[PDB]
Design a protein around this motif. Structure first.
Motif, PDB file in Angstrom:
ATOM      1  N   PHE A 211       0.839  -1.205   0.000  1.00  0.00           N
ATOM      2  CA  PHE A 211       0.000   0.000   0.000  1.00  0.00           C
ATOM      3  C   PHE A 211       0.877   1.260   0.000  1.00  0.00           C
ATOM      4  N   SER A 214      -4.096   5.601  -1.907  1.00  0.00           N
ATOM      5  CA  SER A 214      -5.250   5.180  -2.679  1.00  0.00           C
ATOM      6  C   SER A 214      -5.384   5.818  -4.045  1.00  0.00           C
ATOM      7  N   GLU A 215      -4.713   6.947  -4.263  1.00  0.00           N
ATOM      8  CA  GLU A 215      -4.610   7.484  -5.609  1.00  0.00           C
ATOM      9  C   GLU A 215      -4.088   6.443  -6.606  1.00  0.00           C
ATOM     10  N   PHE A 257     -12.426   7.791  -1.901  1.00  0.00           N
ATOM     11  CA  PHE A 257     -12.100   7.008  -3.093  1.00  0.00           C
ATOM     12  C   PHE A 257     -12.958   7.414  -4.293  1.00  0.00           C
TER      13      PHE A 257
END
Lengths: 321, 317
Positions: A211, A214-215, A257
């Motif tokens: 990770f 989240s982009e 998101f």
């Protein structure tokens, strides 16, 4: 967990749903939950499948959506006897339309029920939901399971039925809509690691990485969806989007998101004409998200999505706006 | 976790909510989310508090509920300047009512902004939500935080406001409602009376099924409400998931709880089940009970709103 429904219909959960919503009634020992305001004046749509995915499909039973949903044990579809029971109940001689998710076990039980109902004079028709574009870890063929995009069939077919569509017309609508829906998901797990294209039951993703925000997750899922849909090459730029939490992802994460995904889809030259965000079809308490895209192939489909229902997980409509 | 909003307003989340919902608008960098449909003919109710409790309170912004909510960083209330921004915008000389959850930090921030607004001529009034009956695990003084039953204030005051209630009358209703609301939670070993920010429960024990858990929570609720002493047996129930508990578990728990409440001789007249106010991804549930002290409260609960986490109403029935 507070309750576990391995091997048994989740009887307490279904009774609790009945107690909560005046418009739903549950038949104990059957897994069948039905819209008790349904008046038999329109063609009924029904569905079902294992527990563990709620609100699919119990939260989509209600006026303008499913007339009934039949729920089995955890990740085990209902028995054909209970499916057949539900078909006979909603039947009034106008046909019955069934939405089945594409899993071997679900196919077997629904097939058995539908075949039997037809021998009894009931004109049952069906469509199989197959929107999952994750791939099998063994031979890299698409899995084609029915996953969160199934709910677009519930909504559009339920609304056209409610407005008076005939069994013949609903089948033709289903055959047009079902090929348009594409869904891909991602999960997080601790070692933190990110699995792209995780299966609805945790089956392995096509790529796993550390990770690093989240982009880049949004970029990857969008790029993988683009590889299947090829929207770059298609004149109709109008899309329906679902951002679906798979069980333990927070609303904060889901809307964050959604923001990243919407910015990317704008840059791709697309117009998202409808979206819905929340826990729409889960997998127990999985930490993950799936994205569903569906071309607005007929503008009327927007009307059908926006119309109000009595189903607890889709109570919103354009009179809000 | 896909995103982490420690120390900052959850700006992308708020922008995302804005893109989703035509009737909602977000004001960048302020944490202020507002109902863009609000026409200023009625008295506005507003709230706010830290991120990490969603949908409290972003999901409760809309027609018939809050005219705006102001969201701070993870578990940190919004700054008074942004609260006061919100107050000024909803204001039109009819008064403004604020629902504040009972935490020291929230009280400091809201107080600063309320007294400032008051000296600018705005008739701002407030109520403090304090439904949590959990206890500090050493010494056992009640904590009295504002927790999930706060949303009963949003819904009832919102609907009364929408109906044309005066700022005077809304305050009186708020003072009537607030003391009726009682809430206790449990986490999963089982920890009874877990704090809303993960503070230790009063008792930890081995998981032996959720029937014993329903019994323990209903017993503690009974000790505060004393429903066996009161002739009015009508209640409102919330069954609230605290973040990672599934719908299967929540409705199963409702069922077990309703089995016990009916044996207590009570009539649950309104029920709402879901993720109503969370604590990040905590695995746990809270129960709220509130006396239907005035039968009109049910009308106020059943009336339709445009807020995304409360779209059910009596026409569904």
């Amino acid at each position: 967990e507070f309750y576990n429904s391995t091997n048994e219909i989740p009887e307490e959960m279904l009774k609790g749903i009945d107690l909560t919503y005046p418009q739903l009634t549950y038949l104990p020992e059957t897994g069948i939950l039905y819209d008790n305001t349904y008046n038999e004046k329109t063609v009924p749509i029904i569905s079902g499948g294992g527990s563990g995915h709620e609100p699919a499909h119990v939260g989509y039973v209600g006026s303008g959506m499913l007339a009934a949903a039949v729920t089995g044990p955890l990740f085990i579809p209902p028995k054909s006897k209970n499916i057949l029971k539900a078909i006979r109940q909603v039947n009034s001689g106008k046909g019955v339309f069934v939405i089945i998710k594409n899993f071997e076990a679900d196919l077997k039980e629904f097939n058995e029920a539908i075949k039997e109902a037809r021998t009894e004079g009931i004109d049952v028709r069906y469509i199989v939901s197959h929107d999952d574009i994750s791939v099998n870890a063994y031979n890299f063929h698409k899995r084609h399971r029915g996953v969160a995009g199934t709910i677009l069939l519930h909504k559009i077919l339920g609304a056209f039925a409610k407005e008076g569509g005939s069994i013949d017309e609903i089948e033709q609508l289903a055959l047009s809509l079902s090929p348009e829906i594409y869904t891909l998901g991602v999960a997080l797990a601790p070692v933190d690691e990110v699995s792209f294209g995780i299966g609805i039951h945790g089956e392995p993703g096509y790529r796993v990485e550390k990770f690093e925000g989240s982009e880049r997750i949004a970029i990857e899922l969008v790029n993988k969806l683009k590889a299947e849909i090829n929207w770059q090459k298609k004149a109709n730029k109008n899309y329906i989007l679902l951002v679906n939490g798979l069980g333990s992802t927070t609303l904060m994460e889901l809307y964050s998101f959604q923001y990243d995904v919407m910015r990317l889809l704008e840059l791709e030259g697309l117009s998202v004409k409808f979206c819905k965000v929340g826990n729409l079809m889960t997998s127990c308490d999985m930490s993950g998200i799936s994205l569903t895209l569906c071309s607005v192939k007929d503008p009327k489909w927007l009307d059908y999505l926006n119309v109000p229902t009595g189903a607890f997980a889709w109570l919103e409509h354009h009179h809000h706006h």
